Amino acid sequence: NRGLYNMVNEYSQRLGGHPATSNTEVQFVVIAGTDVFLEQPCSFLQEAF
Amino acid sequence: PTIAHGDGRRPSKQRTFIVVKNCHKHHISTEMELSMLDLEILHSIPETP
């Protein structure tokens, strides 16, 4: 809901708001993972394809 | 070598691999034949054309 110049900052600023496990056989959420590198555009603009 | 990381992770110390490679051995052999009539003339001395 915040600013567009804040929600592009909070996108790329390593938020990991809705992350997932990379190579885990069963998908999990990461426990504050800084090792993996990921970005979720479906959390920013809120649309599934 | 190792990258120094600022995020809290289990840091790999100074690693050093000691890998050895053992040689192979290939032994080849053909088998040639020689007639004894071609050796009884080889081990003589001739006085005839």
Side-chain angles (χ1 to χ4, degrees):
Chain A
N1 193 27
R2 300 182 199 91
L4 195 55
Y5 275 159
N6 186 29
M7 283 313 114
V8 69
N9 267 324
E10 210 159 318
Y11 182 85
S12 51
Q13 274 261 349
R14 203 60 160 272
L15 185 57
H18 189 69
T21 41
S22 288
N23 47 13
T24 57
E25 44 292 326
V26 54
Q27 276 201 6
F28 293 130
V29 68
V30 309
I31 41 172
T34 316
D35 307 58
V36 307
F37 325 100
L38 80 164
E39 55 181 3
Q40 315 99 12
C42 280
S43 87
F44 164 68
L45 50 88
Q46 280 287 145
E47 293 209 345
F49 311 100
Chain B
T2 319
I3 299 159
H5 276 116
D7 53 87
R9 71 172 72 230
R10 185 193 63 85
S12 298
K13 290 142 171 46
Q14 43 189 356
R15 289 147 309 175
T16 290
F17 284 78
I18 319 289
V19 47
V20 307
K21 286 262 182 181
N22 285 277
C23 80
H24 299 92
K25 290 292 287 293
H26 312 277
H27 170 273
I28 69 176
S29 88
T30 187
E31 185 144 337
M32 61 202 196
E33 211 172 89
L34 278 173
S35 179
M36 208 58 79
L37 273 299
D38 285 337
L39 260 49
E40 290 169 349
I41 311 176
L42 173 62
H43 279 262
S44 295
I45 183 166
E47 54 273 14
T48 306

Coordinates of all heavy atoms in Angstrom, one line a residue:
Chain A
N1 N 0.8 -1.2 0.0 CA 0.0 0.0 0.0 C 0.8 1.3 0.0 O 0.3 2.3 -0.4 CB -0.9 0.0 1.2 CG -2.0 1.1 1.1 OD1 -2.4 1.5 0.0 ND2 -2.5 1.5 2.3
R2 N 2.1 1.2 0.4 CA 3.0 2.3 0.5 C 3.4 2.9 -0.9 O 2.8 2.5 -1.9 CB 4.2 2.0 1.4 CG 3.8 1.6 2.8 CD 5.0 1.3 3.7 NE 4.7 0.5 4.8 CZ 4.7 -0.9 4.8 NH1 5.1 -1.5 3.8 NH2 4.4 -1.5 5.9
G3 N 4.4 3.7 -0.9 CA 4.8 4.5 -2.1 C 5.4 3.6 -3.2 O 5.9 2.5 -2.9
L4 N 5.2 4.0 -4.4 CA 5.7 3.3 -5.5 C 7.3 3.4 -5.6 O 7.9 2.4 -6.0 CB 5.1 3.8 -6.8 CG 5.3 3.0 -8.1 CD1 4.8 1.6 -7.9 CD2 4.6 3.7 -9.3
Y5 N 7.8 4.5 -5.1 CA 9.3 4.6 -4.9 C 9.7 3.9 -3.6 O 10.9 3.9 -3.3 CB 9.7 6.0 -4.9 CG 10.0 6.6 -6.3 CD1 9.9 8.0 -6.5 CD2 10.2 5.8 -7.4 CE1 10.2 8.5 -7.8 CE2 10.5 6.3 -8.6 CZ 10.4 7.6 -8.8 OH 10.7 8.1 -10.1
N6 N 8.8 3.4 -2.8 CA 9.1 2.6 -1.7 C 8.9 1.1 -1.9 O 9.6 0.2 -1.4 CB 8.3 3.0 -0.4 CG 8.8 2.3 0.8 OD1 9.9 1.9 1.0 ND2 7.8 2.1 1.7
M7 N 7.9 0.7 -2.8 CA 7.6 -0.6 -3.1 C 8.5 -1.2 -4.2 O 8.4 -2.4 -4.6 CB 6.2 -0.8 -3.4 CG 5.3 -0.8 -2.1 SD 6.0 -1.9 -0.9 CE 6.5 -0.7 0.4
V8 N 9.3 -0.3 -4.9 CA 10.4 -0.8 -5.7 C 11.7 -0.9 -4.9 O 12.5 -1.7 -5.2 CB 10.5 0.0 -7.0 CG1 11.0 1.4 -6.7 CG2 11.4 -0.6 -8.0
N9 N 11.8 -0.1 -3.9 CA 12.9 -0.3 -2.9 C 12.8 -1.6 -2.2 O 13.6 -2.5 -2.3 CB 13.0 0.9 -2.0 CG 14.0 1.9 -2.5 OD1 15.0 1.6 -3.1 ND2 13.7 3.2 -2.2
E10 N 11.6 -1.8 -1.5 CA 11.3 -3.0 -0.7 C 11.2 -4.2 -1.5 O 11.3 -5.3 -0.9 CB 10.0 -2.8 0.1 CG 10.0 -3.5 1.4 CD 8.9 -2.9 2.4 OE1 8.8 -1.7 2.5 OE2 8.2 -3.7 3.1
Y11 N 11.1 -4.1 -2.8 CA 11.2 -5.3 -3.7 C 12.7 -5.8 -3.7 O 12.9 -7.0 -3.3 CB 10.8 -4.9 -5.1 CG 10.8 -6.1 -6.1 CD1 9.8 -7.0 -6.2 CD2 11.9 -6.3 -6.9 CE1 9.8 -8.0 -7.1 CE2 11.9 -7.3 -7.8 CZ 10.9 -8.1 -7.9 OH 10.9 -9.2 -8.8
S12 N 13.6 -5.0 -4.1 CA 15.0 -5.4 -4.4 C 15.9 -5.3 -3.2 O 17.1 -5.6 -3.3 CB 15.6 -4.6 -5.5 OG 15.4 -3.2 -5.3
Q13 N 15.4 -4.9 -2.0 CA 16.2 -4.7 -0.8 C 16.3 -6.0 0.0 O 16.5 -5.8 1.2 CB 15.7 -3.5 0.0 CG 16.2 -2.2 -0.5 CD 17.4 -1.7 0.4 OE1 17.7 -2.3 1.4 NE2 18.1 -0.6 -0.1
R14 N 16.2 -7.1 -0.6 CA 16.3 -8.4 0.1 C 15.2 -8.6 1.1 O 15.5 -8.8 2.3 CB 17.7 -8.7 0.6 CG 18.1 -10.2 0.8 CD 18.0 -11.0 -0.5 NE 18.7 -12.2 -0.4 CZ 20.0 -12.3 -0.7 NH1 20.7 -11.3 -1.1 NH2 20.6 -13.5 -0.6
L15 N 14.0 -8.4 0.7 CA 12.9 -8.5 1.6 C 12.7 -9.9 2.1 O 12.6 -10.2 3.3 CB 11.6 -8.0 1.0 CG 10.4 -7.9 1.9 CD1 10.6 -7.0 3.1 CD2 9.2 -7.3 1.1
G16 N 12.6 -10.9 1.1 CA 12.2 -12.3 1.3 C 10.9 -12.4 2.1 O 10.8 -13.1 3.1
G17 N 9.9 -11.6 1.7 CA 8.6 -11.6 2.3 C 7.9 -12.9 2.1 O 7.3 -13.5 3.0
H18 N 7.9 -13.3 0.8 CA 7.3 -14.6 0.4 C 8.3 -15.5 -0.3 O 8.2 -15.6 -1.6 CB 6.0 -14.4 -0.4 CG 5.2 -15.6 -0.7 ND1 4.5 -16.3 0.3 CD2 5.0 -16.3 -1.8 CE1 3.9 -17.3 -0.2 NE2 4.2 -17.4 -1.5
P19 N 9.3 -16.0 0.4 CA 10.3 -16.8 -0.3 C 10.0 -18.3 -0.4 O 8.9 -18.7 0.2 CB 11.5 -16.5 0.5 CG 11.0 -16.3 1.9 CD 9.5 -16.0 1.8
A20 N 10.8 -19.1 -1.0 CA 10.7 -20.6 -0.9 C 12.1 -21.2 -0.9 O 13.0 -20.6 -1.3 CB 9.8 -21.1 -2.1
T21 N 12.1 -22.4 -0.5 CA 13.4 -23.2 -0.5 C 13.7 -23.5 -1.9 O 12.9 -23.9 -2.8 CB 13.2 -24.5 0.3 OG1 12.0 -25.1 0.1 CG2 13.4 -24.1 1.8
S22 N 15.0 -23.4 -2.2 CA 15.5 -23.6 -3.6 C 15.6 -25.0 -4.0 O 14.8 -25.4 -5.0 CB 16.9 -22.9 -3.7 OG 16.8 -21.5 -3.7
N23 N 16.5 -25.8 -3.5 CA 16.7 -27.2 -3.9 C 16.0 -28.2 -3.0 O 16.2 -29.4 -3.2 CB 18.2 -27.5 -4.0 CG 19.0 -27.0 -2.8 OD1 18.5 -26.6 -1.8 ND2 20.3 -26.9 -3.0
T24 N 15.3 -27.8 -2.0 CA 14.6 -28.7 -1.1 C 13.7 -29.6 -1.9 O 12.9 -29.1 -2.7 CB 13.9 -28.0 0.1 OG1 12.9 -27.1 -0.5 CG2 14.8 -27.3 1.0
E25 N 13.7 -30.9 -1.6 CA 12.8 -31.9 -2.4 C 11.3 -31.5 -2.1 O 10.5 -31.5 -3.1 CB 13.1 -33.3 -1.9 CG 13.2 -33.5 -0.4 CD 14.5 -32.8 0.2 OE1 15.5 -32.8 -0.5 OE2 14.4 -32.3 1.3
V26 N 11.0 -31.2 -0.9 CA 9.6 -30.7 -0.5 C 9.7 -29.2 -0.2 O 10.5 -28.8 0.6 CB 9.1 -31.5 0.8 CG1 10.1 -31.3 1.9 CG2 7.7 -31.0 1.2
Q27 N 8.9 -28.5 -0.9 CA 8.9 -27.0 -0.8 C 8.6 -26.5 0.6 O 7.6 -27.0 1.2 CB 7.9 -26.3 -1.8 CG 8.5 -26.2 -3.2 CD 7.8 -25.1 -4.0 OE1 6.9 -24.4 -3.4 NE2 8.1 -25.0 -5.2
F28 N 9.5 -25.6 1.1 CA 9.4 -25.0 2.4 C 9.6 -23.5 2.3 O 10.1 -23.0 1.2 CB 10.3 -25.6 3.4 CG 10.0 -27.0 3.8 CD1 11.1 -27.9 3.8 CD2 8.8 -27.4 4.2 CE1 10.8 -29.3 4.1 CE2 8.5 -28.7 4.6 CZ 9.5 -29.6 4.5
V29 N 9.3 -22.7 3.3 CA 9.7 -21.3 3.4 C 11.0 -21.3 4.0 O 11.4 -22.1 4.8 CB 8.6 -20.5 4.2 CG1 8.5 -20.9 5.6 CG2 8.8 -19.0 4.0
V30 N 11.9 -20.3 3.6 CA 13.2 -20.2 4.2 C 13.2 -19.5 5.5 O 12.3 -18.7 5.8 CB 14.2 -19.6 3.2 CG1 14.1 -20.2 1.8 CG2 14.0 -18.1 3.1
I31 N 14.1 -19.9 6.4 CA 14.2 -19.3 7.7 C 15.2 -18.2 7.5 O 16.4 -18.3 7.9 CB 14.6 -20.3 8.8 CG1 15.7 -21.3 8.3 CG2 13.4 -21.0 9.3 CD1 16.2 -22.2 9.4
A32 N 14.7 -17.0 7.0 CA 15.5 -15.8 6.8 C 16.8 -15.9 6.0 O 17.8 -15.5 6.4 CB 15.8 -15.1 8.2
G33 N 16.6 -16.7 4.9 CA 17.8 -17.0 4.1 C 18.4 -15.9 3.4 O 17.8 -15.2 2.6
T34 N 19.7 -15.6 3.7 CA 20.5 -14.7 2.9 C 21.4 -15.4 1.9 O 22.0 -14.7 1.0 CB 21.4 -13.9 4.0 OG1 20.5 -13.5 5.0 CG2 21.9 -12.5 3.3
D35 N 21.6 -16.7 2.0 CA 22.4 -17.4 1.1 C 21.8 -17.5 -0.3 O 22.5 -17.3 -1.3 CB 22.7 -18.9 1.6 CG 23.2 -18.8 3.1 OD1 22.5 -18.3 3.9 OD2 24.3 -19.4 3.3
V36 N 20.5 -17.8 -0.4 CA 19.9 -17.9 -1.7 C 19.6 -16.5 -2.2 O 19.6 -15.5 -1.5 CB 18.6 -18.7 -1.6 CG1 18.8 -20.0 -1.0 CG2 17.5 -17.9 -0.8
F37 N 19.5 -16.4 -3.6 CA 19.2 -15.1 -4.3 C 17.9 -15.3 -5.0 O 17.9 -16.1 -6.0 CB 20.3 -14.7 -5.2 CG 21.7 -15.1 -4.7 CD1 22.3 -16.2 -5.2 CD2 22.3 -14.3 -3.7 CE1 23.6 -16.6 -4.7 CE2 23.6 -14.7 -3.3 CZ 24.2 -15.8 -3.7
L38 N 16.9 -14.6 -4.6 CA 15.6 -14.7 -5.3 C 14.8 -13.4 -5.2 O 15.1 -12.6 -4.3 CB 14.8 -15.8 -4.8 CG 13.9 -15.7 -3.5 CD1 12.9 -16.8 -3.5 CD2 14.8 -15.7 -2.3
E39 N 13.9 -13.2 -6.2 CA 13.0 -12.0 -6.1 C 11.7 -12.5 -6.7 O 11.6 -13.2 -7.7 CB 13.6 -10.8 -6.9 CG 14.0 -11.1 -8.3 CD 14.5 -9.9 -9.0 OE1 14.7 -8.8 -8.4 OE2 14.8 -10.0 -10.2
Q40 N 10.6 -12.0 -6.0 CA 9.3 -12.5 -6.3 C 8.5 -11.3 -6.9 O 8.0 -10.5 -6.2 CB 8.6 -13.0 -5.1 CG 9.4 -14.0 -4.3 CD 10.0 -13.3 -3.1 OE1 9.6 -12.2 -2.7 NE2 10.9 -14.0 -2.4
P41 N 8.3 -11.3 -8.2 CA 7.4 -10.2 -8.8 C 5.9 -10.4 -8.6 O 5.2 -9.5 -8.8 CB 7.8 -10.2 -10.3 CG 8.2 -11.6 -10.6 CD 8.8 -12.1 -9.3
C42 N 5.5 -11.6 -8.3 CA 4.1 -11.9 -8.0 C 3.7 -11.4 -6.6 O 2.5 -11.4 -6.3 CB 3.9 -13.4 -8.1 SG 3.7 -14.0 -9.8
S43 N 4.7 -11.1 -5.7 CA 4.4 -10.4 -4.5 C 4.3 -8.9 -4.7 O 3.7 -8.2 -3.9 CB 5.4 -10.8 -3.4 OG 6.5 -9.9 -3.5
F44 N 5.0 -8.3 -5.7 CA 5.0 -6.9 -5.9 C 3.7 -6.5 -6.6 O 2.9 -5.7 -6.0 CB 6.2 -6.5 -6.7 CG 6.1 -5.1 -7.3 CD1 6.1 -4.0 -6.5 CD2 5.9 -5.0 -8.7 CE1 6.0 -2.7 -7.1 CE2 5.8 -3.7 -9.2 CZ 5.8 -2.6 -8.4
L45 N 3.4 -7.0 -7.8 CA 2.3 -6.5 -8.6 C 1.1 -7.4 -8.4 O 0.1 -7.2 -9.1 CB 2.7 -6.3 -10.0 CG 3.5 -7.5 -10.8 CD1 2.6 -8.5 -11.4 CD2 4.4 -6.8 -11.8
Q46 N 1.2 -8.5 -7.6 CA 0.0 -9.2 -7.1 C -0.8 -9.9 -8.1 O -2.0 -9.9 -8.1 CB -0.8 -8.3 -6.2 CG -0.3 -8.1 -4.8 CD -0.5 -9.3 -4.0 OE1 0.4 -9.6 -3.1 NE2 -1.6 -10.0 -4.2
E47 N -0.2 -10.5 -9.1 CA -0.9 -11.2 -10.2 C -0.2 -12.5 -10.5 O 1.0 -12.6 -10.7 CB -1.0 -10.4 -11.5 CG -1.9 -9.1 -11.3 CD -2.6 -8.7 -12.6 OE1 -2.1 -9.2 -13.6 OE2 -3.5 -7.9 -12.5
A48 N -1.0 -13.6 -10.6 CA -0.5 -14.9 -11.0 C -0.7 -15.1 -12.5 O -1.7 -14.6 -13.1 CB -1.2 -16.0 -10.2
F49 N 0.2 -15.9 -13.1 CA 0.1 -16.0 -14.6 C -0.6 -17.4 -14.9 O -0.3 -18.4 -14.3 CB 1.4 -16.0 -15.2 CG 2.3 -14.8 -14.8 CD1 3.2 -15.0 -13.8 CD2 2.1 -13.6 -15.3 CE1 4.0 -13.9 -13.4 CE2 2.8 -12.5 -14.9 CZ 3.8 -12.7 -14.0
Chain B
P1 N 40.7 -21.1 -2.0 CA 40.4 -19.8 -1.4 C 38.9 -19.8 -1.0 O 38.1 -20.6 -1.4 CB 40.7 -18.8 -2.4 CG 40.5 -19.4 -3.7 CD 40.9 -20.9 -3.5
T2 N 38.6 -18.8 -0.1 CA 37.2 -18.6 0.4 C 36.8 -17.2 0.5 O 37.7 -16.3 0.7 CB 37.2 -19.2 1.9 OG1 37.9 -20.5 1.9 CG2 35.7 -19.6 2.3
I3 N 35.5 -16.9 0.3 CA 35.0 -15.6 0.4 C 34.6 -15.3 1.8 O 34.0 -16.1 2.5 CB 33.8 -15.4 -0.6 CG1 34.2 -15.7 -2.0 CG2 33.2 -14.0 -0.5 CD1 33.0 -16.0 -2.9
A4 N 35.0 -14.1 2.3 CA 34.6 -13.7 3.7 C 33.2 -13.2 3.6 O 32.9 -12.2 2.8 CB 35.5 -12.7 4.2
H5 N 32.3 -13.7 4.4 CA 30.9 -13.4 4.3 C 30.4 -12.6 5.5 O 30.9 -12.8 6.6 CB 30.0 -14.6 4.2 CG 29.9 -15.1 2.8 ND1 30.4 -16.3 2.4 CD2 29.3 -14.6 1.7 CE1 30.1 -16.5 1.1 NE2 29.5 -15.4 0.6
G6 N 29.6 -11.6 5.3 CA 29.1 -10.8 6.4 C 27.8 -11.3 7.0 O 27.5 -11.0 8.1
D7 N 27.0 -12.0 6.2 CA 25.9 -12.7 6.8 C 26.3 -13.9 7.6 O 27.3 -14.6 7.3 CB 24.9 -13.2 5.7 CG 25.6 -14.0 4.6 OD1 25.7 -15.2 4.8 OD2 26.0 -13.5 3.6
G8 N 25.6 -14.1 8.7 CA 25.9 -15.2 9.6 C 25.7 -16.6 9.0 O 24.6 -17.0 8.9
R9 N 26.8 -17.2 8.7 CA 26.8 -18.5 8.1 C 28.0 -19.3 8.7 O 28.9 -18.7 9.2 CB 26.9 -18.5 6.6 CG 28.3 -18.1 6.1 CD 28.4 -18.2 4.6 NE 27.6 -17.2 3.9 CZ 26.7 -17.4 2.9 NH1 26.5 -18.7 2.5 NH2 26.1 -16.5 2.3
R10 N 27.9 -20.6 8.5 CA 29.0 -21.5 9.0 C 30.2 -21.3 8.0 O 30.1 -21.8 6.9 CB 28.6 -22.9 9.0 CG 29.6 -23.9 9.6 CD 29.2 -25.3 9.4 NE 29.2 -25.6 8.0 CZ 30.3 -26.0 7.3 NH1 31.5 -26.1 7.9 NH2 30.1 -26.3 6.0
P11 N 31.3 -20.7 8.4 CA 32.3 -20.3 7.5 C 33.4 -21.4 7.3 O 34.0 -21.9 8.2 CB 33.0 -19.1 8.1 CG 32.4 -19.0 9.5 CD 31.7 -20.3 9.8
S12 N 33.6 -21.8 6.0 CA 34.6 -22.8 5.7 C 35.9 -22.2 5.9 O 36.2 -21.1 5.4 CB 34.4 -23.3 4.2 OG 33.1 -23.9 4.0
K13 N 36.8 -22.9 6.6 CA 38.1 -22.4 6.9 C 39.0 -22.7 5.7 O 38.6 -23.0 4.6 CB 38.7 -23.1 8.2 CG 38.0 -22.6 9.4 CD 37.8 -23.7 10.4 CE 37.3 -23.2 11.8 NZ 36.2 -22.2 11.6
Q14 N 40.3 -22.6 5.9 CA 41.3 -22.9 4.9 C 41.3 -24.4 4.5 O 41.9 -25.2 5.2 CB 42.7 -22.3 5.3 CG 43.0 -22.7 6.7 CD 44.3 -21.9 7.2 OE1 44.9 -21.2 6.4 NE2 44.6 -22.1 8.5
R15 N 40.6 -24.7 3.4 CA 40.6 -26.0 2.8 C 41.7 -26.3 1.9 O 42.4 -25.4 1.4 CB 39.3 -26.2 2.1 CG 38.0 -26.3 2.9 CD 36.8 -25.7 2.2 NE 37.2 -24.4 1.6 CZ 36.3 -23.6 0.9 NH1 35.2 -24.1 0.5 NH2 36.7 -22.4 0.4
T16 N 42.0 -27.6 1.8 CA 43.2 -28.0 0.9 C 42.9 -29.5 0.5 O 42.9 -30.3 1.4 CB 44.5 -27.9 1.7 OG1 44.8 -26.5 1.9 CG2 45.6 -28.6 0.9
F17 N 42.7 -29.7 -0.8 CA 42.4 -31.0 -1.3 C 43.7 -31.7 -1.6 O 44.6 -31.1 -2.3 CB 41.5 -31.0 -2.5 CG 40.1 -30.7 -2.2 CD1 39.6 -29.4 -1.9 CD2 39.2 -31.8 -2.2 CE1 38.3 -29.2 -1.7 CE2 37.8 -31.5 -2.0 CZ 37.4 -30.2 -1.7
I18 N 43.9 -32.9 -1.2 CA 45.1 -33.7 -1.6 C 44.6 -34.9 -2.4 O 44.2 -35.9 -1.8 CB 46.0 -34.2 -0.4 CG1 46.1 -33.1 0.6 CG2 47.3 -34.6 -0.9 CD1 47.0 -31.9 0.2
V19 N 44.5 -34.7 -3.7 CA 44.0 -35.8 -4.6 C 45.2 -36.4 -5.3 O 46.0 -35.6 -5.8 CB 42.9 -35.3 -5.5 CG1 43.3 -34.0 -6.1 CG2 42.6 -36.3 -6.6
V20 N 45.4 -37.7 -5.3 CA 46.4 -38.4 -6.0 C 45.8 -39.2 -7.1 O 44.6 -39.5 -7.2 CB 47.3 -39.3 -5.1 CG1 47.8 -38.6 -3.9 CG2 46.5 -40.5 -4.7
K21 N 46.6 -39.5 -8.1 CA 46.2 -40.2 -9.3 C 47.2 -41.3 -9.5 O 48.4 -41.1 -9.7 CB 46.2 -39.3 -10.5 CG 45.0 -38.3 -10.6 CD 43.9 -38.9 -11.4 CE 42.7 -37.9 -11.5 NZ 41.6 -38.4 -12.3
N22 N 46.7 -42.5 -9.5 CA 47.6 -43.7 -9.7 C 47.7 -44.0 -11.2 O 46.7 -43.9 -11.9 CB 47.0 -44.9 -8.9 CG 47.3 -44.8 -7.4 OD1 48.3 -45.2 -6.9 ND2 46.3 -44.3 -6.7
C23 N 48.9 -44.5 -11.5 CA 49.2 -44.8 -12.9 C 48.4 -46.1 -13.4 O 48.0 -46.9 -12.6 CB 50.7 -45.0 -13.2 SG 51.2 -46.6 -12.7
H24 N 48.3 -46.2 -14.7 CA 47.8 -47.5 -15.3 C 49.0 -48.3 -15.8 O 50.1 -47.8 -15.9 CB 46.8 -47.1 -16.4 CG 45.6 -46.4 -15.9 ND1 45.5 -45.0 -15.8 CD2 44.4 -46.8 -15.3 CE1 44.4 -44.6 -15.3 NE2 43.7 -45.7 -15.0
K25 N 48.7 -49.5 -16.2 CA 49.7 -50.4 -16.8 C 49.0 -51.1 -18.0 O 48.1 -51.9 -17.8 CB 50.3 -51.4 -15.8 CG 51.2 -50.7 -14.8 CD 52.5 -50.2 -15.4 CE 53.4 -51.3 -15.8 NZ 53.9 -52.1 -14.6
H26 N 49.5 -50.9 -19.2 CA 49.0 -51.6 -20.4 C 50.2 -52.4 -21.0 O 51.2 -51.8 -21.4 CB 48.5 -50.6 -21.4 CG 47.6 -49.6 -20.8 ND1 46.2 -49.8 -20.6 CD2 47.8 -48.3 -20.3 CE1 45.7 -48.7 -20.0 NE2 46.6 -47.8 -19.8
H27 N 50.0 -53.7 -21.1 CA 51.0 -54.6 -21.5 C 50.4 -55.3 -22.8 O 49.4 -56.0 -22.8 CB 51.3 -55.7 -20.5 CG 52.1 -56.8 -21.0 ND1 51.6 -58.0 -21.6 CD2 53.5 -57.0 -20.9 CE1 52.6 -58.8 -21.9 NE2 53.7 -58.2 -21.5
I28 N 51.1 -55.0 -23.9 CA 50.6 -55.5 -25.2 C 51.7 -56.5 -25.8 O 52.8 -56.4 -25.4 CB 50.4 -54.3 -26.2 CG1 51.7 -53.7 -26.6 CG2 49.5 -53.3 -25.6 CD1 51.5 -52.6 -27.7
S29 N 51.2 -57.4 -26.6 CA 52.1 -58.5 -27.1 C 51.4 -59.1 -28.3 O 50.3 -59.6 -28.2 CB 52.3 -59.5 -26.0 OG 51.3 -60.5 -26.1
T30 N 52.1 -59.1 -29.5 CA 51.7 -59.9 -30.6 C 52.6 -61.1 -30.6 O 53.5 -61.3 -29.7 CB 51.8 -59.1 -31.9 OG1 51.3 -59.9 -33.0 CG2 53.2 -58.8 -32.3
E31 N 52.4 -62.0 -31.6 CA 53.1 -63.3 -31.6 C 53.5 -63.6 -33.1 O 52.6 -63.8 -33.9 CB 52.2 -64.4 -31.1 CG 52.8 -65.7 -31.0 CD 52.3 -66.5 -29.8 OE1 51.9 -65.8 -28.8 OE2 52.4 -67.7 -29.8
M32 N 54.8 -63.6 -33.4 CA 55.3 -63.9 -34.7 C 55.9 -65.2 -34.7 O 56.4 -65.7 -33.7 CB 56.2 -62.8 -35.1 CG 57.4 -62.7 -34.3 SD 58.3 -61.1 -34.3 CE 59.8 -61.5 -33.6
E33 N 56.0 -65.8 -35.9 CA 56.6 -67.2 -36.1 C 57.7 -67.2 -37.1 O 57.8 -66.3 -37.9 CB 55.5 -68.2 -36.5 CG 55.7 -69.6 -36.0 CD 54.6 -70.5 -36.3 OE1 54.5 -71.1 -37.4 OE2 53.7 -70.6 -35.4
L34 N 58.6 -68.1 -36.9 CA 59.8 -68.2 -37.8 C 60.0 -69.7 -38.0 O 60.2 -70.5 -37.0 CB 61.0 -67.5 -37.2 CG 61.1 -66.0 -37.5 CD1 62.2 -65.5 -36.7 CD2 61.2 -65.8 -38.9
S35 N 60.2 -70.1 -39.3 CA 60.4 -71.5 -39.6 C 61.9 -71.9 -39.1 O 62.8 -71.1 -39.2 CB 60.3 -71.8 -41.0 OG 60.6 -73.1 -41.3
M36 N 62.0 -73.1 -38.7 CA 63.3 -73.6 -38.3 C 64.3 -73.8 -39.5 O 65.5 -73.7 -39.4 CB 63.2 -74.9 -37.5 CG 64.4 -75.1 -36.5 SD 64.5 -73.8 -35.3 CE 63.1 -74.2 -34.2
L37 N 63.7 -74.0 -40.7 CA 64.5 -74.0 -41.9 C 65.0 -72.6 -42.3 O 66.0 -72.5 -43.0 CB 63.6 -74.5 -43.1 CG 63.6 -76.1 -43.3 CD1 65.0 -76.6 -43.6 CD2 62.9 -76.9 -42.2
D38 N 64.3 -71.6 -41.8 CA 64.8 -70.2 -42.0 C 65.7 -69.7 -40.9 O 66.2 -68.6 -40.9 CB 63.6 -69.2 -42.1 CG 62.9 -69.3 -43.4 OD1 63.5 -69.7 -44.4 OD2 61.7 -68.9 -43.4
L39 N 66.1 -70.6 -39.9 CA 67.0 -70.4 -38.9 C 68.3 -71.2 -39.0 O 69.4 -70.8 -38.7 CB 66.4 -70.5 -37.5 CG 66.0 -69.3 -36.7 CD1 65.1 -68.4 -37.6 CD2 65.2 -69.7 -35.5
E40 N 68.1 -72.5 -39.5 CA 69.3 -73.3 -39.8 C 70.1 -72.8 -40.9 O 71.3 -73.2 -41.0 CB 68.8 -74.8 -40.0 CG 68.2 -75.5 -38.8 CD 67.5 -76.8 -39.1 OE1 67.3 -77.0 -40.3 OE2 67.2 -77.5 -38.2
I41 N 69.5 -72.0 -41.8 CA 70.4 -71.4 -42.8 C 70.9 -70.0 -42.3 O 72.0 -69.6 -42.7 CB 69.5 -71.1 -44.1 CG1 68.8 -72.4 -44.5 CG2 70.4 -70.7 -45.3 CD1 67.9 -72.3 -45.7
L42 N 70.2 -69.4 -41.4 CA 70.7 -68.1 -40.8 C 71.9 -68.4 -39.9 O 72.8 -67.5 -39.8 CB 69.5 -67.5 -40.0 CG 69.8 -66.2 -39.2 CD1 70.3 -65.1 -40.1 CD2 68.6 -65.8 -38.4
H43 N 72.0 -69.5 -39.2 CA 73.1 -69.8 -38.4 C 74.1 -70.8 -39.0 O 74.7 -71.5 -38.3 CB 72.6 -70.5 -37.1 CG 72.1 -69.4 -36.1 ND1 72.9 -69.0 -35.0 CD2 70.9 -68.8 -36.0 CE1 72.2 -68.1 -34.3 NE2 71.0 -67.9 -34.9
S44 N 74.3 -70.7 -40.3 CA 75.3 -71.4 -41.0 C 76.2 -70.4 -41.8 O 76.0 -69.1 -41.7 CB 74.8 -72.4 -42.0 OG 74.1 -73.4 -41.2
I45 N 77.2 -70.9 -42.6 CA 77.9 -70.0 -43.5 C 78.0 -70.7 -44.8 O 78.3 -71.9 -44.9 CB 79.3 -69.7 -42.9 CG1 80.1 -68.7 -43.8 CG2 80.1 -70.9 -42.5 CD1 81.3 -68.1 -43.1
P46 N 77.6 -70.0 -45.9 CA 77.5 -70.7 -47.2 C 78.7 -70.5 -48.1 O 79.4 -69.4 -48.1 CB 76.3 -70.1 -47.8 CG 76.3 -68.7 -47.2 CD 77.0 -68.7 -45.9
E47 N 79.1 -71.5 -48.8 CA 80.1 -71.4 -49.9 C 79.5 -72.1 -51.1 O 79.9 -73.2 -51.6 CB 81.5 -72.0 -49.5 CG 81.6 -73.4 -48.9 CD 81.3 -73.5 -47.4 OE1 80.8 -72.6 -46.8 OE2 81.6 -74.6 -46.9
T48 N 78.6 -71.4 -51.8 CA 77.8 -71.7 -53.0 C 77.0 -70.5 -53.4 O 76.6 -69.8 -52.5 CB 76.9 -72.9 -52.8 OG1 77.6 -74.0 -52.3 CG2 76.3 -73.3 -54.1
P49 N 76.9 -70.1 -54.6 CA 75.9 -69.1 -55.0 C 74.5 -69.4 -54.7 O 73.8 -68.5 -54.2 CB 76.1 -68.9 -56.5 CG 77.0 -70.1 -56.9 CD 77.8 -70.4 -55.8

